[PDB]
Amino acid sequence: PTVVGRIPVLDVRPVVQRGRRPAKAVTGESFEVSATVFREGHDAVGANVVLRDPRGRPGPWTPMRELAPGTDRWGATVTAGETGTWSYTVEAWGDPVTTWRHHARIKIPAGLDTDLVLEEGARLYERAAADVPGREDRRELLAAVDALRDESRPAASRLAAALTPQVDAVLARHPLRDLVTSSDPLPLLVERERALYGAWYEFFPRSEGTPHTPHGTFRTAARRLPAIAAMGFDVVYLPPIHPIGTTHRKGRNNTLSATGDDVGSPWAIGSPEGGHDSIHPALGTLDDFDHFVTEAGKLGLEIALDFALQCSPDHPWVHKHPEWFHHRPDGTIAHAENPPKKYQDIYPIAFDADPDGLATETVRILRHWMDHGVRIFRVDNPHTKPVAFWERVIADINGTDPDVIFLAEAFTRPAMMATLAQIGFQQSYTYFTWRNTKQELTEYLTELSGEAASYMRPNFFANTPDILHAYLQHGGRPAFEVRAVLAATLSPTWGIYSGYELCENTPLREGSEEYLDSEKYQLKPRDWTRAAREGTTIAPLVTRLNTIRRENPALRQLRDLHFHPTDKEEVIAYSKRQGSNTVLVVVNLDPRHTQEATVSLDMPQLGLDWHESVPVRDELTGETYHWGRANYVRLEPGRTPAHVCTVLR
Amino acid sequence: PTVVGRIPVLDVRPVVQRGRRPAKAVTGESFEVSATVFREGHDAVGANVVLRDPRGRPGPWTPMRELAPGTDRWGATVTAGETGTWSYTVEAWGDPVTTWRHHARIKIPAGLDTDLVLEEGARLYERAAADVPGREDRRELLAAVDALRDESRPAASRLAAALTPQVDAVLARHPLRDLVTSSDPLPLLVERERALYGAWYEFFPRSEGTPHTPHGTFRTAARRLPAIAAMGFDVVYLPPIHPIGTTHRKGRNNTLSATGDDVGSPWAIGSPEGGHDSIHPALGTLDDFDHFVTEAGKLGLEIALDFALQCSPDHPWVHKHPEWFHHRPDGTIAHAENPPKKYQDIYPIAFDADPDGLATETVRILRHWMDHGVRIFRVDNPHTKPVAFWERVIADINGTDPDVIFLAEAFTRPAMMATLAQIGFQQSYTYFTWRNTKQELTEYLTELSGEAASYMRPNFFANTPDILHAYLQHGGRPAFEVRAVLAATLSPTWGIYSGYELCENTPLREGSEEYLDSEKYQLKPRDWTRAAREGTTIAPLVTRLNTIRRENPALRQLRDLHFHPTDKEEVIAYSKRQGSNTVLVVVNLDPRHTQEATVSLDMPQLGLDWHESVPVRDELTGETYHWGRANYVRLEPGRTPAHVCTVLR
């Protein structure tokens, strides 16, 4: 038993954990399958990819090509179909016809061995016709065989009868493959479109109240849903909707002692009113929640609930399951931390006394909300809980409900972030907010669109309730406009947290990424009507970006992305492609000064020739341009963040 | 059945073809085992490598360390023992003591819960003391436990009693390990020292003849062995010693027609007088071979026979086994080609008709020469035969005789060269002869000493009967001295083909790498006695280089190699280390012009601080120096090709 087959097929990619975890795709997504393929001697080889659906049914004939000269690295693009677990193999084989052609095109014109050479080609084409299924094809090959053996015609006439485009066609479909060798199957997990592509919007229902009842309900907060859908979003992400503890409840601006009417942080879950399977009483009943979900569904909006595996000191688990927490010698439970951040209002979970009870209760809670229409969960801080626990929980839920999507809020070191996606997490938060220079964005997006794309799907939130980057603080509305362009065009999934449209950017203090008067600790009513009428919102820009994404398949994928050089450090340029759709973006990363630059596009990367010129339409303005290998641009902050151009037919 | 453990331990290296082939070492060789190790939350982790011998007995406690901050990549050096098939795993675990220490050193000076902190540390140390085997260790830890619980003492004094170097030593030897998680075992093949370390000498026995009998015999050739051993070599590699064909026998200088007394090419194996198991009648009998082997053994020389799986047209296989060759429609057998090279005097073997008979016959021939003391085989052009054939043959032979070394003579593309080593070849010819500038040499040996060392051991032949590089053609004797210094100091295995020490460098023609009047097609008698008498040889430099290697364990390994920068393109500097032995080498790559430069050593990479001077001795002259962060060198072609220095005490 040899590790290597007759014709070596090695190091098939993509591969996750040496084959023990699946590579990932979504319905209709294209990606490259590659392998190292070669043979002994100098004769030619060929290779093809066999992608099998969940029932074992192979896909179309998919031949591979050597990706670079002298590397023996071969590749071919496949497209994922319906959801489920697929498999793919690589088949390699001797290519006797190419070998005989290449050498017959030398020996016949120079009179060497012609009768012996032409008869050798007749014997090959004969073996080729034996493995050809259709009879019209089978006679096209036997006609070339007979013409090859016709000693009464010139040798150049006999040879050329086997090198015609009509013999090219049969062989480019049913080629003669020698010593066919196969790799071992590699698994592929195909999931639904929303796992890769979608626009996300986060807001606090309790903030959308009334003058008489300032604490909003699910029934008042449902009034925001039409505006959210009108901005082109597909997913509404809600902070925890459960009762909030009173013991050590935090006050406004993250103060230790709440006073009077303070509402506390929604992530300090649990009170005598209920736990993770309960509704905050100021938000209404489980019946109102169904109404909210139903109204969201009518507008094309899916709900994503926050899942925070933690407890306030008043959560029922504290006395019903004391072994789910670590107790110090005096019996107290230390509050959760994530340094240098401290959460004096919550307890972390201990997983090693009763791991089965925790997993059983966790999937029960998730299935409760799944029964009420929640098919997406934003998982709070997964990296402070055991990695294997999430692997077990995700596999349990997806085993019965493969449509459920899990998003990992893991802002941590690279190894943990990769592993969490590799063990099941459909989506991952990223380093996006901390990549603001051209070098940072080019390097990070090269990483996310490269090998990481076989297991990680990025969700680019331009802001979060805990992340107001110094770029937005110092750049004002122009900064908000640039980050929206970048996030919406660089990832097929992007999102914002309410208030971003209004360019809220007052930090807690200098050096902090917290908002002043953070919504996490207080109701935040907003004059949405006045901002629209006074034009002080970038919702129109947000709306246009989502329209452009809904209209251009290139912005609904991740792996096809290429950066084009500019002569200005503040100006970045890149393109993305999907079939015949090509989008080109040029962004001025300077929010305070106008920048002009030449954009030297990589034309073969666009499928064009260096001399060619193409018409483009700036989808932000409707203006038409004609662009070639060198293009002048002038971008003024406030007036224009970027050009978002589509290539016209 | 989760893939990931309690404490994630991931991507264990070295790994070869995802664990389907073993990583390699030789007895006494050290290498690094690495893994990605981390845990949820912020508590500390530890890790260690468990190395098991062919019986399953684990090696010593081998703790790992994080190789670079923030990477979660851990490693530790291991050392292979006896030959056989080993295994290795990485164990990861929570390290609570480190976690508690880092917290207590902050909280006790701050007066924050010090009674609770020291009591948490007492219970931890109690858990540690139960595990330790000795009584002197258990009394030690329990003494620190009681000092922690002594409330009559100050808080800092109670804590300090747990951080004393005595308690540091107990747990550095027997650490408390929580939630021990293990990787799956990976295979490691350990082989004898000769597989990695050895100096080789190739020569044709027939050229060592007499005036009355010009064609040498095994008996006359044996008289050449003393000078070979005196030069410090360990292996003699003989071209094929079998009968040579007559049909299409090449003439002198590779002419297509041999005339009269032309001896022909030894690689054209086969005549009616016998095949691969026979001996050329002009060489003698099997008994004379045995005498040749015995005289080799007496001088400390192993025999390496060339194995060329190919035939002359007069080889008995041509008619006894016709299906071992590819026949054309007319029944003729096309001669072998490695284009644009033609060998009209041999037939290539076909493997697809009777692969079993070929494998059976190949191992039979190999075991016959093994019965006569041949434990090393130089395999001729393995890359024109199927990869799986060599995997099968090497597995069969090494199954009964693991001491047998196979050397792949595969000057081809990188993927086949790497695959051949991974499927079983103990040694590999390399691109050495085509790596002559400082950039070429630095880049190539970074590759060989890096990850490839896990599966490939390089044999640095400075010349072969087919390779006389233009650097030697144009550089004369100084160029021969440069390449011998490089080959001997840069790889633990290196070799020369006879005539190299006489600086034979006359090409067949300009731009060729063939020798003029090549020894492959004619007797090439050499006046060794006159060469030594007249000093027209570099045998002493070869002898001194080989002795330096025998007196310095650093030059007997591959993985440890660092390059140090200089001021001139033509002057290269590098160092190699093994235990206390550190060798420093400075080479003038210019064989025509004297070069002066400053060698700016990376003193940390040497185990010394930046502001320090340390004694060196050039082992080519005996002169001694004192070298530091900067050192002026002056190298003169013909008198000082290079400095070869050991570090003195």
Ligand SMILES: O=P(O)(O)CCN1[C@H](CO)[C@@H](O)[C@H](O[C@H]2O[C@H](CO)[C@@H](O)[C@H](O)[C@H]2O)[C@H]1CO
């Ligand atoms: O801060 P991160 O690094 O991102 C931690 C991630 N989790 C959420 C992420 O969005 C945060 O919403 C949440 O932290 C909020 O909730 C806590 C509980 O009451 C408060 O103690 C904190 O003051 C407040 O900031 C935190 C823990 O659940």
Ligand SMILES: O=P(O)(O)CCN1[C@H](CO)[C@@H](O)[C@H](O[C@H]2O[C@H](CO)[C@@H](O)[C@H](O)[C@H]2O)[C@H]1CO
């Ligand atoms: O030339 P390479 O490209 O490196 C092929 C390498 N193999 C040996 C290398 O060590 C060579 O000794 C050997 O080629 C010699 O023997 C032939 C007998 O058929 C002659 O025809 C050639 O003229 C002569 O050069 C060749 C095949 O066995």
